Amino acid sequence: MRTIIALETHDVRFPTSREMNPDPDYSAAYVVLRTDGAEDLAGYGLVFTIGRGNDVQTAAVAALAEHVVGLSVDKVIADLGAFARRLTNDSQLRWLGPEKGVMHMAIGAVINAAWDLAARAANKPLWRFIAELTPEQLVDTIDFRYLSDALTRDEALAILRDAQPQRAARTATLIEQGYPAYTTSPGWDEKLVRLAKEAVADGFRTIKLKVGANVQDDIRRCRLARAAIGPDIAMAVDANQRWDVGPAIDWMRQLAEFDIAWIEEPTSPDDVLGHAAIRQGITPVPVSTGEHTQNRVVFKQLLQAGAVDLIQIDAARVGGVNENLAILLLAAKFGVRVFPHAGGVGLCELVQHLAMADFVAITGKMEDRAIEFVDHLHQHFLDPVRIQHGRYLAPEVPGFSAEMHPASIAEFSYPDGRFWVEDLA
């Protein structure tokens, strides 16, 4: 009987700051689900952090050990919905949230590691493992509580069944053409126009600029870019939760002329009514949010209030695959596109599977959206993402693409990493 013998965690942080979040140090609360089977059989996952607090985030994950060690691998793998709820339904853990913040993300990491585990066992890349599950198996993994007023399991099944026929075709299409990507690398001011042109030349059909500090600057930067990009390249803007409702409206109306693909997080990630009010005031400028959205219940409300034109999704922010599947289904039912958030540490490696699984088994739509891409720390992963002319190549190796190089962990663990031992000297 294959069993999960250990839940190991590492506080891993990269000094990226030496290259509304200034000086962030991309970090990861790295989790590994060890078993007593082939050394090849293990689950990998991680929570993306930005520096301080990564140690508390790691401790939250380590606190989940008793819930997992001793569990039968086959039992976890055969009931991922049940495994997620064993963590999700621990009322004492819920008190620390519920389903939000540090505790919930820690849980999401362990859940993601479990899916990585199942994918490896099925010997398939996660996106395929997900898309090839029966409509019934998919639905069993999702938590429908608090969602019956917007998405019942029957409605979820309907969507998945109506898409089952084309799964074979979409799979081939994806493997042949890849998934659309967009860059934020040029948007972090002669550089703006330059980097923008290179982006287009590299094949990216969408670009995103940061805004929110000065209207004048934003107006100028958006103009220069629109003209430096042509009128057929999509250009988005991210305000990073900076504005209040009134200011956000006044601000975005001054950027409208430069053809905005969408404004990301114009206000607080908790303000559902606020995003809707902003959207109404700056029409037709599209509004989005999502990288910090706590759980499927807040997403449900975003959709219900018509507060978004499109939505971000994040692999490590919520309750793992189980929760993202629910969100993807919500988005599909309400007819709003999803542009996955990525970047940071391994976010690209992770979120690509979710987007690809959505295309194959749930929407069959990918040319109308794109996965975010940022060129950072990909070398620390065994299965780094591959961008071919502005598009994500479908991963082939088994898993969630979460596994990191031991040498990387050995070099950047905090504060005992070979680098951190020398640094603090």
Ligand SMILES: [Mg+2]
């Ligand atoms: Mg952002």
